[PDB]
Amino acid sequence: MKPSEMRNLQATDFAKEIDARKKELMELRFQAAAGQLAQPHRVRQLRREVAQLNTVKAELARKGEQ
Amino acid sequence: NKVEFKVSVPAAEVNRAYDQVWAGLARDVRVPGFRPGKAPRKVIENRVGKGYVESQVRDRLLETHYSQGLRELGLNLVDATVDPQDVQSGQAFEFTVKGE
Amino acid sequence: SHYDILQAPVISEKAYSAMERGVYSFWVSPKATKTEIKDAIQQAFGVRVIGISTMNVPGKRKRVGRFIGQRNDRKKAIVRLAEGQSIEALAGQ
Amino acid sequence: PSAGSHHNDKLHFKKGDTVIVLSGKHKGQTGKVLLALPRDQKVVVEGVNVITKNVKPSMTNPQGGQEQRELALHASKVALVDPETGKATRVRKQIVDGKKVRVAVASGKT
RNA sequence: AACGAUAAAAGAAGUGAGAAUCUUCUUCGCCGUAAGGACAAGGGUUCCUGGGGAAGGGUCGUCCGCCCAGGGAAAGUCGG
RNA sequence: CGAGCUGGAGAUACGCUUUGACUCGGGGAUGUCCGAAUGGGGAAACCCACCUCGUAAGAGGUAUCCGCAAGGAUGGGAAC
């Protein structure tokens, strides 16, 4: 989520997580308008993890370029 | 003074038992999904088919027994405690309700 | 790109009676075209689509109060298949 | 109502310590604090018990008389009181955790 | 005082806590280069389904173009 | 800082926290569309492009004024 055991990934598998939570949340909305969603926290934490990706790679564009 | 009453119901008259209540209530309950008159199959079990099924029917049948029980006798009974039992995939359903 | 452009599912009675032959419909974001979404519904599930539409869809709604009413705009897309009768399990719903 | 900004955002008590009640009803009534917050400044002690009744429109056979719940309070009590008398905080010691301060008056235990 | 053109109404059936005034039926009448129908500007979601009844409706109101929930307008060729 | 938090409207459930959450300090990164806005157009938030980099997506450039290597500039400020 933040440890050094995550930012070590390159720009191939690390970016794969970006489109991993967006698609997952997509199958969570259909249950919100059908009465099958019983995990309100499945959205809060999810979106919170999505931000823990585009922020890391963004740091690899200033610390290694100046 | 503690007495526990029980009942054993065969899976013979349990399936159709819900098929008449589920479809029966659906023709009355107001669901934003569809209008009161047409119901698919795989939609009601997703809307309230979680705790508004075996639970509602259970509390409904039991309440009827206590209600009519006071209409045929006319004497308030004592205090009883109903206990919710785990529901199976669709077979014999038993329960245990005792009291003082 | 493929999983993007979304909004909310559909559950009417007409959107279902027609879904029996192969007529799906999934809402989309307040901003989307027809060419970009076309390749976001086929590569999302795995089937070719012919028809697809998308346009602003407002809906003023409220209860009580003097705080006006909000206008929520959510475009809707009604795709269609040629030979594909089912995709996964959403058709047998 | 200033959101009860009279005092401050902290609390001189915890949610697992023994706190009594005074300057009110039931004198010398000891108990344990459960729920409490610095915002609206509310305290839930197992000592002060107030019989209340809940009202529910229609939730699958209502049937609810007068249940037994607790009542929230304010800074009308004294937290950490074992010397059979109300005290405060003025002795700060340490053991093996230099990341947490201690409280004491003439004893040392808490 | 007035309840907003002197194109009127009647009965039966139903509903309901309660109906002259809601519904159904069958009659009566009035418009018919219109008091029919289709567009444009303009309004905005008033539309349809189920509910409701304080307020608006110059009486009632169980009804509404009133209040709430939901749903409803998918065109390479009609307009732009 | 510290053992609570999950905004006002306080309601329901799921959850976030003693491997130091919330909150307070203070820096960073994201920053749709409009708005001098300056890509071109335009009844503000709408329409239409072109080029370069490139798996799709996606990113950046694209007014005019003075010097014309950098850079600065025409907009906004109650009152003074």
- The candidate with the shortest Cα–Cα distance to B30, out of B41, B17, B44, is B44
What phi and psi, each to the nearest 5 degrees, are found at residue B56? -55, -50
Number of domains in chain B: 1
What is the spatial distance, in angstroms and rounded to an integer, between the CA atom of A61 and the C1' atom of F72? 30
How many alpha carbons fall within 13 Å on the CB side of residue C82?
Answer: 5
D37 CB-to-strand F distance under 7 Å: yes
CA–CA–CA angle D40, D42, D48 (5° rounding):
155
Q: Residue D45's beta-bridge partner residues? A: D33
What is the spatial distance, in angstroms and rounded to an integer, between the CA atom of C68 and the C1' atom of E43? 17
- The candidate with the shortest Cα–Cα distance to A54, out of A7, A40, A66, is A7
D34 CB-to-strand F distance under 7 Å: no
| D3 phi-psi bin (left φ>0, alpha ψ -120 to 50, beta other) | left
Give dist(CA A32, CA C38) in Å, integer. 25
What are the structure tokens assigned to D92, written together?
A: 């700060």
Number of domains in chain C: 1
Give dist(CA B100, CA C16) in Å, integer. 53
Contact at 8 Å (CB) between D39 and D3?
A: yes
What phi and psi, each to the nearest 5 degrees, are found at residue C75? -55, 155
Resolution in Å, one decimal place: 3.3
What is the residue range of B8's domain?
A: 1-100
What is the residue range of D16's domain?
A: 1-110
Contact at 8 Å (CB) between B6 and B84?
A: no
3-class DSSP assignment, residue D110 = coil
Report which residue type is found at C20: E
Q: Residue B6's beta-bridge partner residues? A: B96
Identify the CATH number of the domain in which residue B98 sits. Answer: 3.30.70.1050
What are the structure tokens assigned to D1, written together?
A: 């109502």
Question: Residue D60 and residue B59: Cβ atoms within 8 Å?
Answer: yes
Give dist(CA C38, CA C51) in Å, integer. 9
Contact at 8 Å (CB) between B40 and A27?
A: no
Q: Residue D70's beta-bridge partner residues? A: D49
How many CB atoms neighbour CB D77 within 10 A? 22
Identify the CATH number of the domain in which residue C60 sits. Answer: 3.30.70.330
CA–CA–CA angle D72, D50, D82 (5° rounding):
65
Q: Which nucleotides in chain F lie closer than 7 A to a protein CB?
A: 1-6, 9, 13-16, 20, 23, 28-30, 32, 56-58
How many alpha carbons fall within 13 Å on the CB side of residue B27?
Answer: 5
Contact at 8 Å (CB) between C51 and C59?
A: no
Q: Distances from the Cα of C83 to the Cαs of B21, B37, B72, C22, C39, in angstroms?
A: 38, 31, 63, 8, 18
* Packed helices A41-54 and A18-29: angle between N→C axes, nearest 10 degrees: 160
Give dist(CA C11, CA D10) in Å, integer. 50
Instruction: Please tell me the total number of residues recorded for chain A in this structure.
Output: 66
Give dist(CA D22, CA D78) in Å, integer. 8
Closest by Cβ to B42, choosing from C12, C13, C93: C93
Contact at 8 Å (CB) between A64 and A36?
A: no
Number of domains in chain D: 1
Transcribe chain C into DSSP letters: --S-S-------SHHHHTTTTS---EE--SS--SHHHHHHHHHHHT-------------EE--SSSS--EE----EE----SS---SSSSS--
Give dist(CA D59, CA C27) in Å, integer. 34
| Gyration radius from chain A CA atoms | 15
Rounded to whole angstroms, the maximal C-alpha distance in chain C is: 52
Q: Distances from the Cα of A63 to the Cαs of A57, A58, A60, C64, D77, in angstroms?
A: 10, 9, 6, 54, 55
Instruction: Please tell me the total number of residues recorded for chain B in this structure.
Output: 100
Give dist(CA D30, CA D33) in Å, integer. 10
Strands (E), chain D: 33-37, 42-51, 68-73
Contact at 8 Å (CB) between D21 and D77?
A: yes
Contact at 8 Å (CB) between C74 and C6?
A: no
* Buried b or exposed e, range B20-41, using 16+ CB within 10 angstroms: eebeebbeeeeeebbeeeebbe
Q: Which residues of C touch B (CB under 8 A)?
A: 11-13, 16, 92-93
Q: Which domains does chain A have, with CATH numbers?
A: 1-66 (1.10.287.310)
C34 CB-to-strand F distance under 7 Å: no
Question: Residue C8 and residue A22: Cβ atoms within 8 Å?
Answer: no
Contacts of C33 (CB under 8 A, 6+ apart): C54
